[PDB]
Design a protein around this motif. Structure first.
Motif, PDB file in Angstrom:
ATOM      1  N   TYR A 167       0.837  -1.174   0.000  1.00 31.49           N
ATOM      2  CA  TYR A 167       0.000   0.000   0.000  1.00 31.49           C
ATOM      3  C   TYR A 167       0.876   1.228   0.000  1.00 31.49           C
ATOM      4  CZ  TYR A 167       0.607   0.569   5.149  1.00 31.49           C
ATOM      5  OH  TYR A 167       1.123   0.707   6.454  1.00 31.49           O
ATOM      6  N   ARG A 168       0.264   2.401  -0.195  1.00 31.37           N
ATOM      7  CA  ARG A 168       0.919   3.677  -0.055  1.00 31.37           C
ATOM      8  C   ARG A 168      -0.020   4.538   0.749  1.00 31.37           C
ATOM      9  NH1 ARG A 168       5.587   4.468  -3.466  1.00 31.37           N
ATOM     10  NH2 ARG A 168       5.336   6.719  -3.178  1.00 31.37           N
ATOM     11  N   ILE A 171      -3.808   3.281   1.226  1.00 34.58           N
ATOM     12  CA  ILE A 171      -4.447   3.081  -0.044  1.00 34.58           C
ATOM     13  C   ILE A 171      -3.826   1.853  -0.685  1.00 34.58           C
ATOM     14  CG2 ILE A 171      -4.766   3.993  -2.320  1.00 34.58           C
ATOM     15  CD1 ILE A 171      -4.663   6.810  -1.209  1.00 34.58           C
ATOM     16  N   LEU A 172      -4.637   0.815  -1.007  1.00 30.80           N
ATOM     17  CA  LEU A 172      -4.238  -0.295  -1.864  1.00 30.80           C
ATOM     18  C   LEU A 172      -3.834   0.203  -3.246  1.00 30.80           C
ATOM     19  CD1 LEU A 172      -7.121  -2.907  -1.178  1.00 30.80           C
ATOM     20  CD2 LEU A 172      -4.751  -2.968  -0.298  1.00 30.80           C
ATOM     21  N   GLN A 173      -2.824  -0.401  -3.906  1.00 34.65           N
ATOM     22  CA  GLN A 173      -2.264   0.106  -5.158  1.00 34.65           C
ATOM     23  C   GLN A 173      -3.281   0.397  -6.281  1.00 34.65           C
ATOM     24  OE1 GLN A 173       1.322   0.628  -5.915  1.00 34.65           O
ATOM     25  NE2 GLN A 173       0.321   1.709  -7.624  1.00 34.65           N
ATOM     26  N   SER A 174      -4.326  -0.449  -6.396  1.00 27.05           N
ATOM     27  CA  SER A 174      -5.405  -0.389  -7.372  1.00 27.05           C
ATOM     28  C   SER A 174      -6.430   0.709  -7.084  1.00 27.05           C
ATOM     29  CB  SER A 174      -6.103  -1.776  -7.476  1.00 27.05           C
ATOM     30  OG  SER A 174      -6.573  -2.214  -6.204  1.00 27.05           O
ATOM     31  N   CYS A 175      -6.352   1.366  -5.909  1.00 26.54           N
ATOM     32  CA  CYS A 175      -7.252   2.414  -5.468  1.00 26.54           C
ATOM     33  C   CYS A 175      -6.583   3.798  -5.468  1.00 26.54           C
ATOM     34  CB  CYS A 175      -7.737   2.075  -4.028  1.00 26.54           C
ATOM     35  SG  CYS A 175      -8.657   0.505  -3.932  1.00 26.54           S
ATOM     36  N   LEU A 176      -5.251   3.899  -5.708  1.00 23.32           N
ATOM     37  CA  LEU A 176      -4.515   5.161  -5.629  1.00 23.32           C
ATOM     38  C   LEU A 176      -4.897   6.208  -6.659  1.00 23.32           C
ATOM     39  CD1 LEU A 176      -2.389   6.911  -4.096  1.00 23.32           C
ATOM     40  CD2 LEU A 176      -0.628   5.885  -5.593  1.00 23.32           C
TER      41      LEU A 176
END
Lengths: 5, 86, 90, 76, 153, 95, 482, 49, 65, 22, 246, 117
Positions: free
Chosen positions: F10-11, F20-25
């Motif tokens: 995540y970031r 934030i999960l990578q696919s939601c950034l």
């Protein structure tokens, strides 16, 4: 018991 | 007896010499013979023997066996650690 | 020549039996705790040697990790690989 | 209709119920058989505890469905 | 039943060998209980004598002494030599017979072994273990891994 | 698949601190049974207890002396005439 | 620290060519793609159907060495040609010396190896998120002053928030709540649902919405937000507004609290739909991750197996009373649950007209991704209830093979052993110390790298696996792996 | 484990010459001795039988 | 041991004649006096058929078969 | 020996009696 | 009359003592190789008899669940120590010669004041028996060796083992010993192996000296020989004794 | 057949070991590059792998210290009062519904009476 005591 | 080996397995002693099972089984036979012999005497004693007074009929409840064993351990069978005495 | 091993593996993959060996080995190694043991051993060697360098880490993990495989898994998966070979080798 | 209850021991018992029967009623029937008072019973079906005032039909409980009986373990 | 040593036949064999008929079952259960306890009792005592001889393979002297210390009668007639058979026998099974008898004369002489003398060597000079004199090579990799564990050197 | 293979990837958004999960950034930026059974734990019937008369007599004597002095009333057992032959008995514990 | 050979490449169009080649290489190992050569089709094996297809299988097109032709797991797919080399005989290394093509993709895991260094390139954040298709969004994703002046920008996790490990202070009797919440925020399916922002369909606020309170716990634990206790306090406030008893004033059950939280998540997904989904088959996080189904069979004394009933479950409640007085294992508990019973019920068989006592059995019809177990640690006696405190041995890996429907019916038949190994991994435990009416609740969770952590309200501590397996489990949380 | 602490502390509570002060010193059976030295024959004399 | 052996008699009463038996049995003290209690039984070594059947069976196993 | 010993003990019909003494 | 189970030498080294199972303890000279005295105060087998570090006083261990401390002049014991619910396997004297350490098959160890009679400290653990004990010269440390096969180092004041040396497979540990200066000890066992252990890896004097568990310097294997004892000489070396050859 | 079978097993075993080691080395290289002062990973409250030389987060054999090496209250010591060194008994939370500092162990009971309003 032993002699002297 | 194979079950005697099975009982040996409880104490981590798998190094027997094969005379031990014969010997301990012989022992237990001797012991229980004497035990349930004098217990039979006591079952007679409750059945009130002398030189002809009544019959001899066997039941052999557990109490008689308990009596016949407590007499043996009265002079045998290393008892509970007698700490307080010592 | 030494293409005997590759040719057999090609037979095992194409026949569907390589998947069944690989899955069975993985299911056993996971269940007997081996997968988490290798991970712990890998983390321990990283700390011991002060390095995350793959080549250096692998050389102290892989001998030990191969040896950790229980006898039961190793001889069971071997027997299964052997049986599949018994069918296709003279 | 008949439904089942997998009791505390795992033994399954059978109840005769209507789709409209209320949870209270069901718990009373379980008490008659198992001897656990209704306020001590937790009855689970499809991941939910069955609540007093509701019916079996509210939870889609059908013929030969199985309810799971547990108690409560309280902690703080 | 209760425990090991099934009293349906064992204790039954005992009593019906004595010449009784009426031994209630629960009594024979309790009797099995007692004799099994006595077994564990004597067995631990002979273990105590075992691990003073600092051996493992319990011999008969261990239990003989273990009787002598329990104020209990000894048991004669069990020689190590002339080993055991446990021959079978069937009845319309019992698995008992002893066919080691029928002697008339013996005139054999025992042979004396050497006395107990000691063999020194050298081992482990300053940490390293020589394999040249009477020592092992790395063959304990073949030993049973619960036994003889550890190797650091 | 293999949920614990690596940490949660995540970031963190630097505006609102949300993980934030990578696919939601981008959008947010918009057999053995018998071994187990063989646990008999046999027992005897009766055990002896080496206890002479003298020791227990002196003990009991001094005991009831102090008991009558400070405070039957001593700490005693209770055995019934029936169903005896058992091995441990209850206690009165009368103060 | 970083690989200098890759850093030399990363300067514009060359970086972008490397992005594309990693993204193309990972696509045939990604479960969520049409290019996936192993992993789309799972039936009686995890690796059946796909893995071994002649045309395009992962075993012969990525796990097969070009030079020695062996099928070896340790192989590398080249970034600069379609060649594949193995580790064991050095053939990937031989290719890197001979052709100068020094970067390879591991075929088991996708990781980039640099054969000039002799190590994996793991430290580069771009490389790691590039494969999951974020390479073309990298400049907005990165934290720069030219993001912060006009747009939101992202940073890597802080060191002491990266694994989410944080205590929750006891606010009265909140140990039943705290133990369950720690299982939930360390559950990967739940974590990834929250971090993906699927609750961005929401009614808005952590005062009123229970799912938003849980999202705030995730933000505070793994990120930076208002205050350490803020999300748990918001959850207590929301829990009070729906059900005062489970709001942490008094001691309560952990399993009841587990079901309550999952039901309130399901209600939130229901309330935020534009139209009412049927339930079951619901499409929320709860009923795609914890939902399984039992098959309750009825077998008559002609061996007619009808009518079978299908019962949805989010957990299984297992009796331990037999197990406490036997060999003390979790498997034996499952065998008690899947045992055959002959019932007390009125039975009339349609096919034979027999009124004999029907055989009933419970078997699993559908297995969930996360399997939750409750051990029934309580028994009822002469007008009193007591706790069954007995140890029950649970494995770290749990095979659900002999508890599934149709396996039992194939025993002795031509189809015997047609059901395969289905292997769950243990990832969390909730334990209870105390009696049936008073005590305390502790949670134990497992994360990446095999580490186990113990959660005792405010106190978080590291623990070994071998101390976890000695614990008196009440609730067990198992996640599917194979 | 903790039950032993419970029971021995209740015991020492009942022992009237064990107050709460020194009962805790009694629980200092987990501090060991300091590293001491061997009596070389440099300073310390011999002793008699 | 006497009082126990009197309670064994299924009558909760006094102890007499149990001392004489206990002495004659456990110790080797006989008293030629007041009580007269002996065994009265030879304690035969054969109940009904089946035990001596085992005897002859193992006997033939010993001799021939 | 232990596994073979238990198997031979099961060879006797008293395996049932052995199974009950748990 | 019966088997011999323990023997000990005189530190002036012109005498010798030897216990047996016939409840005798006996004294021998060494300039004529001849008995002088018999001793009898024990009701059962005597396992190990050990002198004082100075001389004059010796002690014995038995199956009568009691231990007696003797002198050499007087013929009946001076003190009797009774605290074991089973047999007292071994006896030893702390280097000041005012304490005795009994260890038993009850899985416990004890300490005694020779004048007092009664037990100053008790150490419990070691699932299994006990067979041998040792004392480190400086007065902190005792060694417990038993059938469990785990050596345990105990601290007299703590009553809690400072270290739990793990090794030695799964076999009885018959004998062991410390150094001249407590730097190192040695175990010696029935798994056909001797095992040197460092002792100061985690103690109050953490000597580490850097470049199954640790505190294990080296293991020297033997030719299928169970080993029975050791004796550190004055100098660096040990001196061992085993049996069975090959 | 045995040699070929050992060879097949060894290829399966070595590929699996290499896969696990690659995952481990890459993760730890990422953690060390990301955090140069790494002493502890995020971890969880539940104990992970048993302590080793690369044990992150403070591990106490005695069971008394948390992942930062600090005391929680695993000692019920004290002087009969103020004991615990002040754990949760001496902590307070500001309640936003009534503007009061509330003792942290009383937040739940306070909430039920405060949110009543």
């Amino acid at each position: 018991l032993h002699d002297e005591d | 007896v194979r079950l005697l080996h099975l009982i040996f397995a409880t104490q981590n002693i798998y190094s027997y010499q094969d005379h031990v099972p014969l010997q301990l089984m012989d022992f237990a036979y001797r012991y229980t013979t004497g035990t349930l012999q004098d217990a039979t005497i006591y079952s007679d004693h409750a059945h009130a023997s002398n030189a002809g007074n009544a019959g001899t009929n066997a039941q052999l409840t557990t109490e008689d066996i308990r009596l016949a064993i407590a007499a043996r351990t009265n002079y045998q069978f290393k008892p509970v650690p007698p700490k307080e005495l010592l | 020549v030494q293409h005997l091993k590759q040719q057999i593996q090609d037979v095992l993959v194409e026949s569907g039996k390589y998947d069944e060996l690989s899955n069975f080995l993985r299911s056993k190694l996971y269940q007997v705790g081996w997968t988490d043991e290798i991970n712990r051993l890998t983390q321990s060697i990283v700390t011991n040697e002060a390095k995350p360098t793959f080549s250096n880490v692998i050389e102290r993990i892989e001998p030990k990790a191969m040896d950790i495989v229980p006898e039961h898994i190793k001889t069971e998966i071997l027997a299964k690989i052997e049986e599949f070979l018994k069918d296709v080798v003279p | 209709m008949q439904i089942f209850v997998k009791t505390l021991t795992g033994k399954t018992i059978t109840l005769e119920v209507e789709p409209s029967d209320t949870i209270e009623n069901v718990k009373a029937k379980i008490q008659d058989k198992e001897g656990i008072p209704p306020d001590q019973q937790r009855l689970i079906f499809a991941g939910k505890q069955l609540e007093d005032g509701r019916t079996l039909s509210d939870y889609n409980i059908q013929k030969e469905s199985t309810l799971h009986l547990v108690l409560r373990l309280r902690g703080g | 039943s209760h425990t090991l040593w099934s009293p349906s036949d064992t204790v039954k064999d005992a009593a019906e060998s004595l010449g009784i008929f009426n031994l209630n079952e629960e009594a024979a259960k309790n009797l099995a209980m007692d004799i099994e306890y006595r077994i564990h009792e004597i067995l631990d005592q002979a273990s105590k004598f075992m691990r003073h001889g600092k051996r493992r393979t319990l011999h008969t002297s261990d239990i003989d002494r273990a009787l002598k210390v329990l104020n209990l009668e000894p048991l004669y007639g069990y020689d190590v030599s002339r080993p055991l058979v446990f021959k079978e026998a069937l009845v319309g099974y019992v698995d008992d017979d002893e066919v080691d008898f029928e002697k008339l004369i013996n005139e054999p002489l025992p042979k004396v072994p050497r006395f107990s003398t000691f063999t020194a060597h050298w081992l482990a000079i300053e940490g390293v273990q020589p394999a040249i004199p009477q020592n092992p090579s790395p063959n304990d990799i073949k030993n049973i891994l619960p036994i003889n564990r550890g190797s650091m050197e | 698949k293999d949920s614990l293979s690596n940490p949660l990837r995540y970031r963190i958004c630097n505006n609102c601190d949300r993980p934030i999960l990578q696919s939601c950034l981008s959008k947010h930026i918009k057999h053995q049974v018998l071994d187990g059974v063989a646990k008999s734990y046999p027992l005897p019937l009766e055990r002896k207890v080496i206890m002479p008369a003298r020791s227990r007599s002196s003990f009991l004597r001094m005991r009831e002396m102090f008991a009558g002095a400070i405070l039957l009333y001593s700490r005693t057992a209770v055995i019934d005439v029936d169903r005896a032959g058992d091995y441990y008995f209850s206690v009165r514990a009368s103060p | 620290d970083s690989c200098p050979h890759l850093k030399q490449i990363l300067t514009s169009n060359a970086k972008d060519t490397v992005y594309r080649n990693y993204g193309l290489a990972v696509n045939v190992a990604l479960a969520l793609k049409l290019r996936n050569g192993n992993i789309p089709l799972y039936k009686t094996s995890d690796g059946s159907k796909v893995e071994y297809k002649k045309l395009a299988r992962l075993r012969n097109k990525a796990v097969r060495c070009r030079e020695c032709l062996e099928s070896l797991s340790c192989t590398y797919f080249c970034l600069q040609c379609s060649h594949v080399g193995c580790w064991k005989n050095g053939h990937a290394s031989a290719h890197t010396k001979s052709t100068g093509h020094v970067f390879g993709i591991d075929s088991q895991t996708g990781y980039i190896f640099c054969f000039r260094c002799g190590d994996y390139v793991g430290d580069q954040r771009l490389e790691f998120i590039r494969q999951s298709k974020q390479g073309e969004r990298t400049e907005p994703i990165m934290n720069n002053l030219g993001t912060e002046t006009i747009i939101d920008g992202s940073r890597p996790p802080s060191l002491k928030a990266s694994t989410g490990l944080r205590g929750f202070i006891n606010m009265g009797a909140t140990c039943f709540m705290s133990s369950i919440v720690q299982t939930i925020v360390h559950n990967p399916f739940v974590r990834d649902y929250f971090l993906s922002g699927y609750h961005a369909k929401c009614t808005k606020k952590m005062d009123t919405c229970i799912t938003c309170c849980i999202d705030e716990i995730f933000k505070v634990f793994y990120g930076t937000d208002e205050t350490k206790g803020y999300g748990p306090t918001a959850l207590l406030t929301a829990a009070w507004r729906v059900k005062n008893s489970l709001a942490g004033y008094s001691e309560q059950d952990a399993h009841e609290f587990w079901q309550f939280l999952l039901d309130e998540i399901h209600k939130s997904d229901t309330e935020l739909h534009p139209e009412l989904d049927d339930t079951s088959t619901c499409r929320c996080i709860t009923h795609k991750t914890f939902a399984g189904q039992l098959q309750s069979t009825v077998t008559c004394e002609k061996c007619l197996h009808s009518k079978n009933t299908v019962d949805p479950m989010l957990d299984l409640s297992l009796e331990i009373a037999k197990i406490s007085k036997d060999k003390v294992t979790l498997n034996d508990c499952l065998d008690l649950f899947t045992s055959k019973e002959k019932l007390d019920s009125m039975t009339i068989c349609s096919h034979c007209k027999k009124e004999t006592t029907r055989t009933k059995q419970l078997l699993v019809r559908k297995l969930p991704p996360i399997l939750a177990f409750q051990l029934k640690r309580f028994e009822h006696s002469a007008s009193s209830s007591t706790k069954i405190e007995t140890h029950v041995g649970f494995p770290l890996f749990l095979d659900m093979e002999p508890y599934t429907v149709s396996e039992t019916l194939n025993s002795n038949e031509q189809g015997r052993a047609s059901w395969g190994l289905m292997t769950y991994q243990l990832f969390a435990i909730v334990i209870h110390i105390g009696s049936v009416n008073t005590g305390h609740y502790i949670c134990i969770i497992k994360n990446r790298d095999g580490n186990w952590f113990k959660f005792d309200d405010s106190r978080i501590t590291l623990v070994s696996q071998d101390y976890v397996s000695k614990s008196n489990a009440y609730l067990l949380y198992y996640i599917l792996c194979q | 484990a903790a039950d032993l602490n419970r029971i021995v502390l209740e015991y020492l509570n009942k022992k009237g010459y064990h107050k709460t002060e020194s009962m805790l010193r009694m629980e200092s059976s987990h501090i060991p001795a300091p590293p001491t030295n061997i009596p070389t024959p440099q300073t310390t004399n011999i002793s008699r039988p | 041991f006497a009082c126990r052996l009197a309670k064994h008699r299924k009558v909760d009463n006094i102890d007499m004649r149990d001392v004489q038996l206990h002495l004659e049995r456990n110790w080797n003290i006989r008293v030629p006096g007041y009580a007269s209690d002996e065994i009265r039984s030879v304690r035969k070594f054969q109940p009904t058929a089946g035990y001596n059947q085992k005897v002859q069976g193992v006997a033939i196993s010993k001799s021939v078969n | 020996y232990e596994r073979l010993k238990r198997d031979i003990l099961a060879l006797p019909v008293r395996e049932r009696r052995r199974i009950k003494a748990i | 009359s019966g088997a011999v189970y323990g023997v000990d030498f005189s530190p002036d080294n012109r005498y010798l003592i030897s216990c047996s199972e016939d409840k005798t303890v006996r004294l021998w000279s060494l300039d004529t190789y001849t008995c002088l005295v018999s001793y009898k105060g024990h009701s059962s087998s005597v396992w190990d008899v050990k002198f004082s570090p100075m001389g004059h006083y010796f002690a014995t261990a038995s199956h009568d669940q009691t231990a007696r401390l003797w002198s050499c002049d007087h013929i009946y014991p001076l003190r009797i120590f009774a605290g074991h619910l089973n047999d007292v396997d071994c006896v030893e004297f702390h280097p000041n010669s005012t304490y005795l350490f009994t260890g038993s098959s009850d899985k416990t160890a004890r300490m005694w004041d020779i004048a007092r009679g009664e037990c100053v400290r008790v150490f419990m653990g070691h699932s299994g028996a006990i067979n041998c004990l040792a004392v480190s010269p400086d007065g902190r440390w005792l060694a417990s060796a038993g059938e469990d096969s785990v050596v345990c180092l105990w601290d007299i004041s703590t009553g809690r083992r400072i270290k739990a040396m793990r090794g030695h497979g799964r076999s009885s540990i018959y004998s062991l010993a410390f150094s001249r200066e407590g730097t190192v000890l040695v175990s010696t066992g029935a798994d056909n192996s001797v095992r040197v252990w460092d002792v100061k890896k985690n103690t109050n004097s953490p000597s580490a000296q850097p470049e199954a568990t640790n505190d294990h310097m080296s293991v020297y294997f033997t030719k299928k020989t169970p080993v029975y004892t050791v004796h550190f000489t004055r100098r660096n070396l040990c001196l061992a004794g085993g049996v069975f050859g090959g | 057949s045995e040699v070929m079978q050992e060879t097949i097993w060894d290829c399966l075993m070595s590929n699996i070991l290499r896969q696990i080691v690659i995952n481990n080395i890459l993760q730890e290289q990422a953690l060390r590059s990301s955090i140069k002062a790494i002493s502890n990973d995020d971890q969880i409250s539940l104990k992970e792998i048993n302590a080793q030389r690369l044990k992150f987060v403070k591990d106490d054999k005695d069971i008394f210290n948390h992942i930062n090496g600090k005391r929680s209250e695993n000692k019920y010591n004290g002087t009969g009062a103020d004991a615990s060194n002040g754990t949760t008994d001496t902590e307070y939370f500001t309640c936003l519904n009534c503007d009061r500092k509330i003792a942290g162990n009383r937040f739940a009971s306070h909430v039920d009476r405060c949110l009543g309003g």
